[PDB]
């Protein structure tokens, strides 16, 4: 399951990480179509050149925030689901017919989840510097003549939800670091 | 679960809070897309300047009422879900192998839920003073020249639903205060 | 549950009220988006003044019929759900460790359901006198100059569904009165 | 349930009526939004008069075929659900603490279902004489000047689905008559 | 269930027919709204005559491919559901209180499914000769003056999905013929 | 089920293939309507010729990426579902009244899944050479006069999702090859 447990997860990996993951899922669900639903259609530019709106939008939004967060959530949830599948497979094999391997697998899964969180946060920072979206953008790309003034839709609400998601991801990273440190200390 | 119980919840925290939470959930579901569905598209201004509608809408509606209430509900439901997860974890631990800690955790959860309710109500008051929405708004923000007359969509229905949601949240705050007071009195 | 039972509900409160409630729910579901889906967009007025359509629509439809009926259904279903929750709470308390209190609670719940039905019917009568909707409406409200001719969408179908819902609500009121009278007679 | 059974239903009331009801439900589901989805928006008239399209559509389609069939299905399913609820209530009463009364109740339920089928078919015949829909309609109603040429959307597909639904309803009426006759013969 | 079994179905009627039916269901689900969603709105003609688009579309598409395939699937699934209902009824009757009748019923059901498949394929061939859809169509029907050039939307994707569905239906017909032949041979 | 098991599946066919299949399903679900939803409507060309947009779109997108991936996923999942159905049928037959045949069936199923993956990847390469989509396309097809400049919607996001899906399919092909080799080695 999401942020799955393996009989080795501590309190900060069984109680808090699941809560944060569910919170992110719910926020993404309630903001996926309400806020970013009309990101393309409401996006208009101040020009008479045909086809300038689409090229400007693709220039300033290479990949939307909602879909980037969706990919991040899917890739974060993948290792936990893989660990759960492996545990079920091992149980089935034992029934048809070990703790250290499971412990190391869980540690590697937490490490990979932390790595995915960090790389997705870095990608988000690289694509969209800053936490705020501006109402007006200046675009100079073919076929738009010289520079044109395009207007983004709902910058303030998108900024609020971006702050929420970034804070949640930072909390997830901190909790993953704490979980890794606690497991290492307990093992030694 | 929503407004969860911990074997320590009284009648005013097990029977009434859950009913109010379900009522708020149902109202938000039946008003999320019906009323606020076309808040952006039906919103039009009396100008010929391109891009003025979007900037005016973002100026007068930094974050929509529906999404603000959704975030409030999610953050209110988070502590109860966390407490339920902790209780399940403790039961699993005891099975694999205490009342005062659970009591204090429940008290802290109720306090945090009350705090979230109060802070969200204060934020709603700060963003949107008053309980009523006007049909006509005067907007003077770039690129709109001087002052322009924008028209809101369905102000009366939104006012009615705002009154409903605010009354429900006030009842929730009162019930949380009563629950905290009753628990403190019973403990002492 | 909807029009819930408490081991004290008679034949006219266990068999007929539930059927009527389910009938109203199904009618509202099949008419919520099909008929009232384009109540705002198809609504057009005979003027060139920008922003007159929205103000006219808000003037003649302070709150749509579908959402008014939805609120009525939610508030009618609330007392039954509260009674069911209280019964479950009492059963849990007795298991962890009375008929007259349950009987009085059920009577009060039926009374409150009747009161909500009556008040919502009165509100519907006050907002929309008569059972029929006209195709043409004359509106004289700012910014529309003098009087303008607005045209409602699907008045006949909305009239038919209004007749259905009003008849169902009247049957509900009659059955609630009969249930209260029968319980009073049986008790005495 | 739909076309419910009461331990007294024969082969033509337990096996065939349920199949026909499910067939009608599936046809209505697959034709509700695909065919009649854009009945109002694609409906256009050959005039420059504002507001003529809506009045013409309301004149020629007082209530759409899909919603009429939905109401017919709901009212047909109501007596069976009521009988099932009564049977469950009687079983609960007997457990807490008769065949002829149940038999008469089932007979009355079948009679009422037949009556609803007949009255809805008659209403459909009265509102829409014939089985075919024409592409062109002549409308002379205020505010449209003199006579205007309105164009219906997808008349052929709607005619095909109307034929399907009418044939299914006729089969239902025949089967209900056969069930009543068979029960009367068996009883005597 | 879909392509149901009756303890008499062989390998080619229990393993392969169900797979083909599920494949057709999934293809229809993934192509119902994605491809044929905007068949009417994207359909435009090269004329200034009002109302010509709708009459041309109804002329060239009497009933859409998606809805024709949906009706075919419903009518194919009907006999299997009827047989399953009859088997359940017989089991209930025996519990309350034969193989040859069930065998003959299954044979008749397979024959009727084959007949429905063949008749629907013939109807599809009669309405739409060939397997390919052309981009341009010449339409000469009132009120369009003389001949007009209408343009179909997504002809290539619709051709691909038509080929898929026709191949699947042909495989279904072949498997039904094989099942009937195998049952006849085994019986004799 | 998806990438089903047959008691003969190894670790790389029970744990990893299922994870990759679920990842592809989730990516397709979250990108089906968000990215490719307005592929046709937002697609505009720089011409005044009516009907040129639709013919140009059909020329440059014979079948959309989302539906091609959906067909690929359905055809990949078909053999596993068929194998599961056959296993259930064999279990039912044995209950009513072998390992080598099941092993060979599983091997053939894996081979067919690999073949479908390879053929769909080759088809995708043939239809859309390269991994990137360009903003501007030059189209010269009737009725568009000479060459016209059409503009694609969201090329960068579609490129990102294409890279994701192609990488996932390549991983699936590699894992299928490894599974076949491992089974062959273990058998010999």
From Swiss-Prot, chains A, B, C, D, E, F:
Listed result of changing residue 52 to F: In CMTX1; moderate
Record note on what altering residue 14 to G does: In CMTX1; non-functional channel
Impact after mutating residue 26 to T: In CMTX1; functional channel; localized in the Golgi apparatus without reaching the cell membrane
Listed result of changing residue 176 to I: In CMTX1; localized to the endoplasmic reticulum
Origin superkingdom: Eukaryota
Compartment list: Cell membrane; Cell junction, Gap junction
Keywords of this entry: Cell junction, Cell membrane, Charcot-Marie-Tooth disease, Dejerine-Sottas syndrome, Disease variant, Gap junction, Membrane, Neurodegeneration, Neuropathy, Phosphoprotein, Transmembrane, Transmembrane helix
Reported effect, residue 26 to K: In CMTX1; localized to the endoplasmic reticulum
Resulting phenotype, residue 143 to R: In CMTX1; suggests a failure to incorporate the mutant protein in the cell membrane
The family this protein is said to belong to: Belongs to the connexin family. Beta-type (group I) subfamily.
Pathological association: Charcot-Marie-Tooth disease, X-linked dominant, 1: A form of Charcot-Marie-Tooth disease, a disorder of the peripheral nervous system, characterized by progressive weakness and atrophy, initially of the peroneal muscles and later of the distal muscles of the arms.
Subunit structure, interactors included: A connexon is composed of a hexamer of connexins. Interacts with CNST.
Protein name (record): Gap junction beta-1 protein
Annotated organism of origin: Homo sapiens (Human)
Gene that encodes the chain: GJB1
Part of the intact protein present: 9 to 217 of 283
